[PDB]
Amino acid sequence: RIGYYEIDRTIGKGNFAVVKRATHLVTKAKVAIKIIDKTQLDEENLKKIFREVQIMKMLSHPHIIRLYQVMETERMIYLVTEYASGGEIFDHLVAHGRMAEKEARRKFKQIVTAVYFCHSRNIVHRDLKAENLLLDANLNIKIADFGFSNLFTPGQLLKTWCGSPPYAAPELFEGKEYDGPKVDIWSLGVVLYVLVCGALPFDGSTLQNLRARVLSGKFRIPFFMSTECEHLIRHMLVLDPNKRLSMEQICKHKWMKLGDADPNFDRLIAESQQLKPLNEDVLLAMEDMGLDKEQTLQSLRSDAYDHYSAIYSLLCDR
Ligand SMILES: COc1ccc(N(C(=O)Nc2c(C)cccc2C)c2cc(Nc3ccc(N4CCN(C)CC4)cc3)ncn2)c(OC)c1
Numbered sequence: 364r365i366g367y368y369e370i371d372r373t374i375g376k377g378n379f380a381v382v383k384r385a386t387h388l389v390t391k392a393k394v395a396i397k398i399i400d401k402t403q404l405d406e407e408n409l410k411k412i413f414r415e416v417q418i419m420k421m422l423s424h425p426h427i428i429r430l431y432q433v434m435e436t437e438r439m440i441y442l443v444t445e446y447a448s449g450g451e452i453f454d455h456l457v458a459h460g461r462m463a464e465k466e467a468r469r470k471f472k473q474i475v476t477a478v479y480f481c482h483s484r485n486i487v488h489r490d491l492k493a494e495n496l497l498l499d500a501n502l503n504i505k506i507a508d509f510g511f512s513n514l515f516t517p518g519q520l521l522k523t524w525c526g527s528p529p530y531a532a533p534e535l536f537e538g539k540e541y542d543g544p545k546v547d548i549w550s551l552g553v554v555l556y557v558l559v560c561g562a563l564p565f566d567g568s569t570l571q572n573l574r575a576r577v578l579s580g581k582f583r584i585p586f587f588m589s590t591e592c593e594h595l596i597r598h599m600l601v602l603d604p605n606k607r608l609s610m611e612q613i614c615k616h617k618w619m620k621l622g623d624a625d626p627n628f629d630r631l632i633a634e635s636q637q638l639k640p641l642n643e644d645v646l647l648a649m650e651d652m653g654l655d656k657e658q659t660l661q662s663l664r665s666d667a668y669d670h671y672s673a674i675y676s677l678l679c680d681r
Pocket residue numbers: 374375376382395396397428442443444445446447448449450451454495497507508509
């Protein structure tokens with residue numbers, strides 16, 4: 364037990380972190396808690412985790428994992444998030460293999476909504492990979508690991524070479540300054556390919572081999588891949604960043620449009636395209652628990668991600 368949380372499973376173990384499932388003992392919500400030992404952490408790694416957390420706080424969206432609370436001790440950091448009860452896409456692909464385009468379109472449309480929203484808030488992910496995508500109880504997408512993400516100014520070039528080589532755009536291998544979104548659009552091309560094909564478009568027995576594959580820009584279209592799907596991927600996996608589809612063009616592609624109507628997609632993409640409240644009954648419910656409404660409002664106003672913020676948010680998403 365950790366504050367208001369009862370831990371009931373360990374689901375992750377990597378980096379300097381362990382992730383557990385927990386239950387919030389007031390709201391009954393299932394959460395994931397990532398526990399980071401700072402006594403393992405290097406100086407720049409702490410500056411990384413700090414930026415990761417700051418970016419996650421900027422992102423409230425249906426297809427992005429939601430951060431609810433930060434707890435910090437002298438020794439440990441605790442990050443409490445929405446729990447994705449479907450697991451990772453990796454395990455789904457191991458279990459069931461390459462997805463039918465019907466399935467791939469549903470999920471990719473959800474991925475695109477999430478990434479488009481990041482861009483609308485001047486965030487680039489810069490590490491989009493299929494395998495690490497999370498799934499909720501209905502196998503709906505939630506995008507996670509923002510460990511390589513950053514703020515960008517539209518038009519500005521970035522100069523940190525990051526992410527996983529199989530998903531990395533050629534200009535990242537080449538050590539060029541890069542447009543943030545165009546890097547994400549390349550990664551999206553590889554993720555779409557993986558979902559439909561169950562394999563990577565660019566691969567190799569060494570990183571040197573793989574690097575040459577990416578810079579070549581050639582990949583195999585399998586017999587089972589539709590003409591429309593092929594066209595989408597080929598318009599994302601273009602060597603010149605400037606000849607890649609925009610996010611706006613990706614949403615409009617004919618592969619997206621065929622199949623069942625999709626009001627949520629269009630609504631979410633519309634919301635991301637915009638330029639320009641307090642729930643009183645939540646505040647009252649909290650007050651009747653024994654949380655003073657003054658400290659709750661202070662916690663909310665300061666963007667604290669503390670005990671009171673968590674409970675406010677967890678109740679509102681219920
Ligand atoms: C796989 O390795 C992990 C393990 C855990 C997380 N994880 C976070 O780390 N979240 C997070 C937190 C807490 C804080 C900060 C940032 C982030 C990103 C997380 C997973 C999750 N659902 C879920 C359930 C079960 C399974 N599998 C069950 C079957 N397999 C045998 C074992 C694994 C995978 C995922 N729901 C929410 N968060 C993760 O995210 C990429 C990958």
